[PDB]
Write a protein that binds this ligand. Structure first.
Ligand SMILES: O[C@@H]1[C@@H](O)[C@H](O[C@@H]2CO[C@@H](O[C@@H]3CO[C@@H](O[C@@H]4CO[C@@H](O[C@@H]5CO[C@@H](O)[C@H](O)[C@H]5O)[C@H](O)[C@H]4O)[C@H](O)[C@H]3O)[C@H](O)[C@H]2O)OC[C@H]1O
Ligand SMILES: [Ca+2]
Ligand SMILES: [Ca+2]
Length: 167
């Protein structure tokens, strides 16, 4: 397979709670803003339920901040070419009903090329997919997933199998 992103299925990362948010997960930047006074738990889980490989990322939300991105997992680097159109695909589910996630892609100036907005995550694995075009001259971009929605408090959201593919 060919993908723009790195370690899209967390298969590179040792199982366990992630405390090193910026660099503990190859291919990813995890970020919790200081406005999040009850911080989440990020965990790489080894599980037979994994859509891809043996591992998933789990995000347990115990509170939120001011903006959905104050709890986020961002794929970086994402290696792309100007003008090219890409397909984004990921799988997600949640421990409980009611979860909300936005799946986005943007440049280092935080301008979004596209997103899936307030996706309704269920207790069953589902694919979430969209297309975007790199409409500027960037070659290295990023893919922020936003979890800091108030509706997610008391839930755990699981993601796996991020694949950004040359359409
Ligand atoms: O520590 C640092 C981090 O702070 C930094 O995080 C990045 C900050 O920038 C973030 O990007 C912003 C995300 O919010 C976007 O605005 C959204 C766009 O979507 C609008 O919703 C639309 C509603 O209609 C739908 O049809 C449509 O699909 C939706 O888009 C929504 O109302 C807006 O609020 C801003 O445009 C972005 O700039 C980025 O995600 C973070 O990763 O990262 C660096 C780190 O050092
Ligand atoms: Ca996986
Ligand atoms: Ca990183």
């Amino acid at each position: 397979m060919l993908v723009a992103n790195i370690n899209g299925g967390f298969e590179s990362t040792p199982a366990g709670v992630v405390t090193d948010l910026a660099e503990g997960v190859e291919g990813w930047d995890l970020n919790v803003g200081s406005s999040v006074t009850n911080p989440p738990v990020f965990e790489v889980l080894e599980t037979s339920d994994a859509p891809e490989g043996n591992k998933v990322l789990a995000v347990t939300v115990n509170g939120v901040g001011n903006n959905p991105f104050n709890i986020q997992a961002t794929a970086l680097p994402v290696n792309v070419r100007p003008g090219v159109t890409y397909t984004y695909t990921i799988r997600a589910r949640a421990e409980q009903d009611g979860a909300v996630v936005s799946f986005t892609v943007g440049n280092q100036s935080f301008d979004e090329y596209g997103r899936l907005h307030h996706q309704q995550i269920t207790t069953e694995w589902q694919p979430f997919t969209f297309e975007f075009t790199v409409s500027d001259q960037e070659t290295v971009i990023r893919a922020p997933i936003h979890f800091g929605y108030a509706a997610n408090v008391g839930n755990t959201i699981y993601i796996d199998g991020l694949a950004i593919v040359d359409l």
